[PDB]
Design a protein around this ligand. Sequence first.
Ligand code: 10E
Ligand code: SF4
Length: 309
Amino acid sequence: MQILLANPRGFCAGVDRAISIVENALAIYGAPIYVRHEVVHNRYVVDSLRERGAIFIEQISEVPDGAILIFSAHGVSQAVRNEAKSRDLTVFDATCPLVTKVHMEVARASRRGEESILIGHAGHPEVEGTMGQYSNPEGGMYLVESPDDVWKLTVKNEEKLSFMTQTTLSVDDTSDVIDALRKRFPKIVGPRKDDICYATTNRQEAVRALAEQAEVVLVVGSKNSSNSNRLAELAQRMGKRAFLIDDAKDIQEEWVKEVKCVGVTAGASAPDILVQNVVARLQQLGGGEAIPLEGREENIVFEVPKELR
Ligand SMILES: C/C(=C\COP(=O)(O)OP(=O)(O)O)CN
Ligand code: SF4
């Protein structure tokens, strides 16, 4: 059987930056380093950092005075940021720049008392952080997950209305939600398309090509990785058996038993080593040399703050 690898796949610029921030802080200050939320949604990465002295928390109260605290790549609300500021803490912000960009727009609409709508998944830390940039009771900040949510939403002033999105959404589904928003609120404003980042768009494009060729698709990523979930979902919708997996140990032989061609990709938070071990396991199951698919070349890098080298 043939093993195909999607391209691109794996680490994006924001994830690589966030991890490097925690690593460098550990190196520079030693353990412990506190981190608000899993730095990226990958078990392998988080487990490793935890063993190295990082302690992952959700609320600032669980952090002691005089600590070093890092905000995860997904971002935090203004309330969290302020609580951190009011406490005696040294703070580093690993929030991806492409998340921050969305935050700035929500904060602007808040200042104007003008309503905003976020497309995203309820309960996700990025959504909590982005909705948490809005604090004007005179305006409004509304979450929609689907066209149905749009069909039910009422707002105070549809003449002064904008939208923003989560960075890791399904490209296809988000298109449908925007279409709905513009039909219901013809004066709504937003970006030219959405706030889905290059990495999300690119990895979804790449898994679409992969799924066209492969019969089964393995997506390396943790259960709580939204972008990784969208990749598995995309392949399933195309009629392929697709599995979200943390590592090679998760591979059940029945999945690939009589399969001529298996595809592998990885979400934005999954390190390459996990992919190499997945490939190694597929080769034990009859696979050959992994063939990388041709794909769009990414070139963006986000540097760590100077203070962290
Ligand atoms: C930090 C971030 C994506 C990187 O992947 P992740 O850590 O798996 O997170 P998400 O669940 O996809 O948001 C959202 N911009
Ligand atoms: S998925 Fe996109 S927005 Fe999120 S960290 Fe990676 S590059 Fe940044």
